[PDB]
C-alpha cells in the first residue's frame, strides 16, 4: 500500500503565473525573460516542496543545495509537460496559464527544437495515460536523478531514500496483474531516463543564454542566476552523474 501518496498530493505546489503581458508583440527577449521570471518563482515553490518531501531535510544541507541545483530543470520540465497534458492535451506548452507557447512562440523563442522536444515529452503523458498519482511519484524521483561524480556528503542515506521513492512508484502502480505492473514500471522509468538527455540539452541552451544575457537582453533573476552559476558549468564539464533506471 502506498505510504507517500497522500503526502505528495498535499505538498504539491499550486500553479505559478508568469505575469506576461500577452498584448505585446512577442520577441525572443520578451519570451525568454518571461520564462526566467516564471522559473524564479517556480523555484521558490520547488524548494518549499522539496523541504516537505519526507527525508529530504534529513540530508546534509549541502546535499540539499546540490540536489536542488541539479534537479530544478528536470522537475520543472516534467511538471510543465503534465500541465500541457492536462490543460491542452499536449498540443502546446503550458508553461503557465498566462504563458502558453503555440508554434509561433516556439519559433520566436530561438529554442524551437527544444520546445518540440518538450512537446514530445508532453505527448508521452498522453500515450502512456499517466495518472496523477504516477506523475507525483515520478516528479519526486527527479530530485534523486543526478548526483556528483564524487558523490554526496551523505551518499548512503541518499541511496536508501531514493530507493524508498522508487519502491513507492512500484507500490502506486500495483495499487492502481503483476506482469502488466512490472511493464508499467519499466515504461514510466524509461520515460524518466529519456528526460535526462533533454534536460542536458536544456542545460546547454541555458548556459549559452546566460553567457549572452546582456547582448540578448534576456534578464536572469537573482536566484536563477545563482543556481545556474553554482552547477550548470559543472554539469556541462562532466562533473555530475545521472542515475538511470535502465
Amino acid at each position: 500500500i502506498p505510504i507517500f501518496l497522500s503526502v505528495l498530493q498535499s505538498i504539491e505546489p499550486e500553479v505559478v503565473y508568469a505575469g506576461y503581458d500577452n498584448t505585446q508583440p512577442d520577441t525572443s527577449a520578451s519570451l525568454l525573460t518571461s520564462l526566467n521570471e516564471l522559473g524564479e518563482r517556480q523555484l521558490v515553490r520547488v524548494v518549499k516542496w522539496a523541504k516537505a518531501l519526507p527525508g529530504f531535510r534529513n540530508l546534509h544541507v549541502d546535499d540539499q543545495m546540490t540536489l536542488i541545483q541539479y534537479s530544478w530543470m528536470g522537475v520543472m520540465v516534467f511538471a510543465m509537460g503534465w500541465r500541457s497534458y492536462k490543460n491542452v492535451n499536449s498540443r502546446m506548452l503550458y508553461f503557465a496559464p498566462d504563458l502558453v507557447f503555440n508554434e509561433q512562440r516556439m519559433q520566436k523563442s530561438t529554442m524551437y527544437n527544444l520546445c518540440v522536444r518538450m512537446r514530445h515529452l508532453s505527448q508521452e503523458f498522453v500515450w502512456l495515460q499517466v495518472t496523477q498519482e504516477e506523475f507525483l511519484c515520478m516528479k519526486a524521483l527527479l530530485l534523486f536523478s543526478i548526483i556528483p561524480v564524487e558523490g554526496l556528503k551523505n551518499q548512503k542515506y541518499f541511496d536508501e531514500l531514493r530507493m524508498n521513492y522508487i519502491k513507492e512508484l512500484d507500490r502506486v502502480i500495483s495499487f492502481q496483474n503483476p506482469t502488466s505492473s512490472s511493464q508499467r514500471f519499466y515504461q514510466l522509468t524509461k520515460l524518466l531516463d529519456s528526460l535526462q538527455d533533454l534536460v542536458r540539452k536544456l542545460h546547454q541552451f541555458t548556459f549559452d543564454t546566460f553567457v549572452q544575457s546582456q547582448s540578448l537582453s534576456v534578464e536572469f533573476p537573482e536566484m536563477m542566476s545563482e543556481i545556474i552559476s553554482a552547477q550548470v558549468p559543472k554539469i556541462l564539464a562532466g562533473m555530475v552523474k545521472p542515475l538511470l533506471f535502465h
Binding site: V44, V47, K48, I68, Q69, E222
Partner: peptide, 12 residues
C-alpha cells in the same frame, strides 16, 4: 549567503 540557502533554512 545564498538565496537558495536562505530558502532552505527559513521557516516554510
Amino acid at each position: 549567503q545564498a538565496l537558495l540557502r536562505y530558502l532552505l533554512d527559513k521557516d516554510d
